[PDB]
Write a protein that binds this ligand. Structure first.
Ligand SMILES: [Mn+2]
Ligand SMILES: [Mn+2]
Ligand SMILES: [Mn+2]
Ligand SMILES: [Mn+2]
Lengths: 456, 460
């Protein structure tokens, strides 16, 4: 038994002042009038972040991502996030269970906060189409990623894409896509080398917005044809929001996600001199600052509805260095998991782009309702896991590597001045972070078995 | 020397009355009181005098199924002539691992000595590996070809992938070639196709529901996006539905060079006609399929406000008996295609001009001129001006006649517009100032057709 009193609680809908009362793992009562007191006067009390886009301990390049399931989830916790959903990678000619098996073992004993999996799909031949039944019922997985890019590495063709969509329809699974046209990026990529333009800046100009716009449109069209449901990850540009908007107007179930770096960084930052740009090499690439406004408008009027990190990080030394000679080899990815919550707060709420209620919905709730974790996760209500987060909106602080908790040598928002700080984080009503201290234990994270798809 | 007098001449722009004067192969002067010293008179009082149709979409003597198309280059071009058309542009098919010249070589020999009117080729592209990218240079300069078709459908038969599609676009940019695409998503059609069989829906009607509009919309959009990325230029052939015109409109608003084509059957037929008891629907099996009647209006609006700009036949015909019969058991095997080359011109006239959908000047532009300018045959073809080949067509707009197999000239056992009452009739057709058809009689000769070497792309 724990007792948060003095708090002003904020949810996707509500904003009020009241004591919440945790017992065991769950919120149990809320209101006025022997248990561990915890004072939250003047702080906001909010549901735990959920970050539906993670790659902890992933291979990409001949190397692996810096954070593991321990360092990763700690950093998430430190930065306000209580549940992640990571991407389990399948390998063509591929016992689907032996993949999942591997991703469980990647977490077991390391994770400190709760976590679920998405399942990647590489080919959709009969073998795989079969296993999918077992996994959705037995293995607690109900969302499926197909990459339309990374040619000859993760890329699916329209066939796989469609078959998966129709099966997803049949089973109750959310298909997710990385919507860039592999084929056109490859050419532009191999051409930019032909000409000897090998700086990291050309990672950005070798995958122009028109190519995200295109795959997004495409993946939407099949969804339409299939009668299934879509969730485009990491929408970075206007070309794509446009296509998403358009379909949602016709009433199809298409969904949208961004990350902070597309809300708060632009391409100019890549054009820097000493390989500094490689700090920004990730896919889709950063975009002209015009786009940030559109992405934000989308979040505000409910056109995009979730935000994730696509945390997938590599050290500037040794790892990002892997391709000084050429940007093909820079392992694509950023360290984004920790600051996500608070840049949403500071750049969005604090400067009048979204409401405080929307800030919760965008970072926590809506992701739960789309990924089948609701109401166990993503709200403060009676019954819900006590993934609470006490949050001080008044702090002014500067984001830096010197002070972040991710296991990486840099921070892409380095030097950015920001409001708001995470004071303490509960996970199922145990402290993971208290007064800004890691009091958690590795292995305390539980897998979350998610339910099948349902609307919002 | 020939002398058309009494005529009211109509072009893409002009409409006036005057005598034209042909000498040799070419128009030479126009007006009143010309110097027509002892030259063959030809009376055209009360008829319209117009440039020859150009039909930029033909497959004469093509293999599709294990069988070949009914018309050859002789029966075909004759029928074209009978129905107002003086120049075609046919699709030369390449075969993966494929001397590009040995394909072309074949398509020349398919025409030589058979063709009666002039003809050019498009070149199909199956893969765009380095070997092929190389040959393209030779062909555009030497072989007179400057337009390139990539099929986004017909999986495991003619289908290209986005790679081929893009590489070809960027090359086309570089060389000066118009890329053309058949914009349907092969992959989604295959699945729907193999599913419809799974369930035992094998009638020809399911040819139409196994390739819904959303799938044309999608490929059209896609093909446009690469064109954008490539800086190249596009020509979507046979737009059948609103989903695609929309995508074409959208891009032409942003100013890119994207172009559009329909055929008559999408302007004048709808899906209901497929749902018929016995194998009757197989008469309509072709791709893209017929569509809901709502779409006709949009296609027409597009032509009128300049959003689509050409019309072709996609004449590719097969006999109802024996040939279309090839798949009573299932529609996968119906060889896809219709007999559309002959009536094209006059349905454009009768359903469009005559009922107030387009202007008479537009009717020429839509059937003749604009196709010349996009395919690099202008001003040799597609207008009545001094210098231009004398591909004239005297045309009687007052006739009322019923279209039928009993009376058409294509070498096929049926007519898809069978029974349709129509205004306008072709009286006589000249090709480089020799009669091919006179007072509705075939006075032409096989072999008189000349290949047209076309120029590289340029706007409009
Ligand atoms: Mn991605
Ligand atoms: Mn990702
Ligand atoms: Mn076609
Ligand atoms: Mn065709």
């Amino acid at each position: 038994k724990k007792w948060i009193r003095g708090g002003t609680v904020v949810t996707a809908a509500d904003t009020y002042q009241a004591d919440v009362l945790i017992e065991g793992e769950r919120v149990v009562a809320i209101g006025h009038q022997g248990a561990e007191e915890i004072d939250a006067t003047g702080c906001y009390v909010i549901p735990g972040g959920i970050d539906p886009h993670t790659h902890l301990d992933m291979p990409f390049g001949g190397t692996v991502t810096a954070d593991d399931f321990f360092t990763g989830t700690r950093a998430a916790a430190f930065g306000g996030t209580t549940s992640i959903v990571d991407f389990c990678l399948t390998k063509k000619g591929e016992s689907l269970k032996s993949a999942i098996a591997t991703w469980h073992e990647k977490a077991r004993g390391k994770a400190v906060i709760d976590y679920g999996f998405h399942l990647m799909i590489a080919e959709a031949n009969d073998q795989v189409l079969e296993e999918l039944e077992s996994v959705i019922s037995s293995e607690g997985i109900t969302s499926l990623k197909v990459f339309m890019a990374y040619k000859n590495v993760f890329q699916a063709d329209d066939e796989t894409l469609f078959k998966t969509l129709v099966k997803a329809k049949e089973l109750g699974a959310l298909v997710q896509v990385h919507a860039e046209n592999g084929d056109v990026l490859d050419y532009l990529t191999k051409k930019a080398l032909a000409e000897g333009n090998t700086d990291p800046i050309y990672h950005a100009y070798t995958r122009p917005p028109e190519a995200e716009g295109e795959a997004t449109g495409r993946a939407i069209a099949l969804t339409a044809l299939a009668g299934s449901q879509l969730y485009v990850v990491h929408v970075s540009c206007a070309s794509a929001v446009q296509r998403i908007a358009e379909a949602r107007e016709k009433g199809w179930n298409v969904y949208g996600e961004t990350c902070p770096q597309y809300l708060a960084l632009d391409v100019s930052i890549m054009d820097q001199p000493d390989f500094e740009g490689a700090k920004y090499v990730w896919s889709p690439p950063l975009r002209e600052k015009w786009n940030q406004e559109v992405l934000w408008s989308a979040l505000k009027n409910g056109i995009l509805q979730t935000v994730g990190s696509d945390h997938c990080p590599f050290n500037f030394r040794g790892q990002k260095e892997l391709g000084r000679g050429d940007f093909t080899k820079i392992p694509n990815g950023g360290p984004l998991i920790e600051d996500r919550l608070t840049i949403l707060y500071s750049e969005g709420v604090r400067q009048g782009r979204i409401s405080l209620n929307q800030f919760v919905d965008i970072s926590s709730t809506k992701a739960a309702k789309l990924f089948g974790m609701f109401p166990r996760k993503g709200t403060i209500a009676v019954g819900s896991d006590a993934d609470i987060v006490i949050f001080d909106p008044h702090v002014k602080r500067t984001l830096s590597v010197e002070t972040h908790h991710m296991n990486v040598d840099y921070n892409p928002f380095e030097g950015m001045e920001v409001y708001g700080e995470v004071v303490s984080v509960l996970s199922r009503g145990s402290f993971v972070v208290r007064d800004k201290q890691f009091v958690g234990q590795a292995g305390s994270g539980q897998y979350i078995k998610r339910t099948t798809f349902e609307q919002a």
